[PDB]
Write a protein that binds this DNA or RNA. Sequence first.
RNA 1: CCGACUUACCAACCCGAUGCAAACUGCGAAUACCGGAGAAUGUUAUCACGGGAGACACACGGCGGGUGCUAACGUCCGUC
RNA 2: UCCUCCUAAAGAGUAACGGAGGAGCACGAAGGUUGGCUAAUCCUGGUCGGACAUCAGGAGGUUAGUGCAAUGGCAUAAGCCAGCUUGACUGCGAGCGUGACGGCGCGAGCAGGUGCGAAAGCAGGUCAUAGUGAUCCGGUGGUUCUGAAUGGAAGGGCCAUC
RNA 3: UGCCUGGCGGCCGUAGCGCGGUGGUCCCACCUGACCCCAUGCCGAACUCAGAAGUGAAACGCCGUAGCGCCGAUGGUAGUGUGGGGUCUCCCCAUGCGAGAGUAGGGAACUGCCAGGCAA
RNA 4: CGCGGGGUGGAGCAGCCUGGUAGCUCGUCGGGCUCAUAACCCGAAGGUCGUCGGUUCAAAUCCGGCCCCCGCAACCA
RNA 5: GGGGCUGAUUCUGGAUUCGACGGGAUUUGCGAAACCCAAGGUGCAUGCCGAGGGGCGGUUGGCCUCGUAAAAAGCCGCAAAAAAUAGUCGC
Lengths: 75, 116, 45, 177, 50, 136, 150
Amino acid sequence: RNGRDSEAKRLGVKRFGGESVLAGSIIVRQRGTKFHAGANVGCGRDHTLFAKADGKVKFEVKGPKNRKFISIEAE
Amino acid sequence: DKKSARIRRATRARRKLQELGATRLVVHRTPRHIYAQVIAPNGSEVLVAASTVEKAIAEQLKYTGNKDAAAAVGKAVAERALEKGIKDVSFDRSGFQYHGRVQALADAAREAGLQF
Amino acid sequence: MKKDIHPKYEEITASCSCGNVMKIRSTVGHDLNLDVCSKCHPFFT
Amino acid sequence: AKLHDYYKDEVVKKLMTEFNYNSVMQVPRVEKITLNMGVGEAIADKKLLDNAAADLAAISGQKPLITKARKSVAGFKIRQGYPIGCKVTLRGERMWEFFERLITIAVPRIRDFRGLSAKSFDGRGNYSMGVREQIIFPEIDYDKVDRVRGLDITITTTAKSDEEGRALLAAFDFPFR
Amino acid sequence: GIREKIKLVSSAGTGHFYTTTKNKRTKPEKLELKKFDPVVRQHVIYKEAK
Amino acid sequence: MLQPKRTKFRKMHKGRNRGLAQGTDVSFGSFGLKAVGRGRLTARQIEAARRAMTRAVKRQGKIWIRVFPDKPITEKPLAVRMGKGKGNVEYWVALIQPGKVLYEMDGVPEELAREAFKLAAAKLPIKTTFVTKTVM
Amino acid sequence: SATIALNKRARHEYFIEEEFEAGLALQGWEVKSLRAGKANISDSYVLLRDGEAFLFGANITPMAVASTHVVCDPTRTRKLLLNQRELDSLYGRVNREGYTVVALSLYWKNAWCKVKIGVAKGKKQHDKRSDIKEREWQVDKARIMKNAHR
RNA sequence: CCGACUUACCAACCCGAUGCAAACUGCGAAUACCGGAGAAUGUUAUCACGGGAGACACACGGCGGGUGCUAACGUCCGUC
RNA sequence: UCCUCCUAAAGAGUAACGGAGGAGCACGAAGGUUGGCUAAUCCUGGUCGGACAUCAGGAGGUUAGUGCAAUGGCAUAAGCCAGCUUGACUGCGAGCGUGACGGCGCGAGCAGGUGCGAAAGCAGGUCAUAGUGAUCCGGUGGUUCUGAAUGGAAGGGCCAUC
RNA sequence: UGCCUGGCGGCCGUAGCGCGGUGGUCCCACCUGACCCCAUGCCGAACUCAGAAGUGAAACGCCGUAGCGCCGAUGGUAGUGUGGGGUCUCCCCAUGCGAGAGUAGGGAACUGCCAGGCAA
RNA sequence: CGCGGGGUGGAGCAGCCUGGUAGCUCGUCGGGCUCAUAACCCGAAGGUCGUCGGUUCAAAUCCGGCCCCCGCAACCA
RNA sequence: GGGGCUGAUUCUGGAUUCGACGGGAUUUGCGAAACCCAAGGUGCAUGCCGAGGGGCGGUUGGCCUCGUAAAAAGCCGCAAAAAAUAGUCGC
């Protein structure tokens, strides 16, 4: 009455901190909103944070509740 | 509480202005005063700030904190804004409903020659 | 405060028939003369 | 504004000499009475509330107001979003004359009057009163009506303690039995 | 399943239509939404079909 | 018999009995029996050790049992092949690490309690030692 | 319809005058066995003391066994849900040495056990011969009457 | 019956103390993994393209586990 | 067959007749925008009304809710209410993640063109992750694109679709 | 500049609560009044406008308060990388990283800009 | 997939067509009826004709539809 | 031993045993138990000691009673507690 399991969706992080990528490259696949938009980072329909422009990916924690932010410095 | 309940409404407006890197146009309402400031996208340095709490500007008006006082300082802060070449702004609601005194303040800035 | 959904009004002038007059704004209907006043209301004896 | 002028001069100088109020805002003030008639049994028929609103229809400016269900209860055969009762939130100027229509002339119209409770409080200093019926109001002529629907009225003042609000009640002829 | 597909044809003379779903049992009324017609390059009303 | 009520999961993994005990020393009573061997204590072993331990005092004092099984162990039925899912529940053992205080007693002299835990140790599978109340 | 086993033999032995449609309270295993499950009704009577009118003779056994722990007996004095109008009048015309309340039939009223109960009077055997004669007397009378027209 | 006193004890809240959890986490490594910088060394070890394949029955040992009795020269994965 | 958690050893991914569960839909609005508001559960008191209705008062804090299973989320609410609408629009789409492939997903922005809001802005569906079958075959509308000696027509191609 | 307040931030619990004193000159809040601007599943509560008589009650701010939350060592310990060993379902040694938790304690914030008030 | 008709009192069947001026009986209640019931006798009740429009002086009728009951050969994704 | 089926007529949500019975609440008549106020009556009484308790013994951890000691009321086993406690059929 078991053994029925789904197939993995390949979630997680695609580019880490200090990595420079072009616009439209997917940064992080996630279900919830653990990583939020910083600078030059937009949020998709399914919480897919995508690179709006060029530059390096920065992982930062800001805010009153200290939410995680993904920001791109255009370098 | 009416103060901080209004503030969280304005937080949605303030997120869009700083994420897009756009200069905002903030306001603040008082039963007897009115306030309007121009704030740089840095978020901690304010460029142009003219209000009816100023003694040199409220003395030209009878009552401070009504539609005639908001329209007086709406034109006054806009002339100082165009002296710096500022032409790109967005009117922050600051939680207040855009019907009356806050609206009539912004039309005075539209009257002086600033579009937003 | 809001508009038009608070139970209706009808101005009358009333007076109790015991030597006491209570003439106020009210929302009864056409008019009414009261029968018992607070002065004759038995909470003393 | 009949007893409000009585409140502003007589009661205000009474209260500040009563609890030693060193501030003019420190004296509690009556602000709202909440007139609610939870008839309740209008789950199947609408006219048990519409006529209840029509029996309620004689207080403030205009058309009557009904309520909605707070949540779903199996015990009284109700679900979520149900017109169950009718309520009134009367704060401001128009609610002052309602006191004279309730505490001065409706009290002699009480069937078998003995005395009002003095231990019916919200804890903060706000009283809640209850009437068995509706005939004590002069509005109902007892001819076209068909019900004996009572209605809980809760007076919510700006009181800090219960006896401080009771001192306001004592200044407004409360029959403490 | 009980919600079935329909054909949402425009009010204009073009044969272009939309294909979406409505519940005929739940909603006996039809849909009239001013969509975009690519042939007219404008907005016209759209009526249901079979 | 010791048994959990409304367990979150009926079946659980085998796991690894690794590490040391997270129970420090004597806290409740005055004299304790701290386990030294590494192994698992079934629910039937504890009660059988409880009866022999309580036999010496016959009612006296209170015996603070600081352990609990809270771990069902499955056993496949006899003469069935491997696989075909997981076996049902048969008994409940306690993951016991070395240095774990098993039973605490109080209100009795230490001389009488010495045989009371030692007789419990014979029914217990694991090797244990008598310990006193800790200082500081 | 939803009728259950009926005491038709009671009509031969008793000459019941007035009837009732009082309901019967019954346990959880009784309801399942009542639709089907071999409920018997023979020798059904009452044992009133104050308001305790009980259907006495009613053998209903659990077909599919639904009995655990505490006991479950197929024959019980099941409590009848009787109206108060129908209750005080049975301090009178049932205590006459021969008067009793019997159940003619058992049935349902929209998934509720309502039992048709009636106040029996009881026939002695000397008048039992007359009734069996009378039933044959009615049939043979028209046989003589039809012979005028042959 | 009154019911006063008493009671092992069965008993929720609240707090203190004590343990357990793969499907509990307010904590949190080691390594692993990704990206950037640098020198050393590596008959390019890298990627791409074209031709030709075989192969898709693995086994044990070490480690991390499921399963089995932490039973199997047992089974099923990851890893060397 | 697909989706969710664990197994799975902190990248992704990873099997068993391993351990827990869900889906073969639903909404024309439950959509979009604009504006507004913020739960659970208690005790305080009050006509029916009491443990469970209606109302007011405070604690409390999102244990509430999110059409539906779990997980990750969400008050800047993704929760709730009201206003007006159809962006649940078309042609594209740099660039990416995902697979042996077929295939799937994200995507700023361009043009046409629409709605909301004064406006920056947002909408090319629903908080996200299941709610579904390739090709062939044939049905329907559109499109001369082709149409066999020519003229049409038949029949196909293409586009929309069953 | 100093003392203040208000507007906007950085960082976001050492930054948050409880509790005790504080202020109305300027400012801010309460308020006053409201046909009309306008608000509303209700009555100028909130929302909205017109005024400011009165108050610092409440809010807010400051100060005190560790009564709590919070941050937090050194060391020790768990765990682990790699290399060997054993009574190799678990451990030891070599070396590398080093917790969590607790303890000593730290701490009831700090910082940037603009405008009016009073002292300079 | 598109071919054959009918939908009318609570019920089952006609009037419609060959236009205008809706009934029948089954089930009901009203009475008779009766040592008792009933056999049986009569009294009464009910749908504007499935729905919506058009033609027609005149629509239940006729015609346009739409909906329902089906019956049918199709049925090679 | 395993698999499937069925498990009160609704077989997928709206049980309303038409009933004394068990339970709560409301209205209603008001009672030291559904209460307190020494006030209207109202001067010599109350409580603890002593003190016995219907016919027998006991009896409220406390009583109708006792001006310093043997009689008087509720109640417990005792005892006036009844019987074809539905019909119908028999020697």
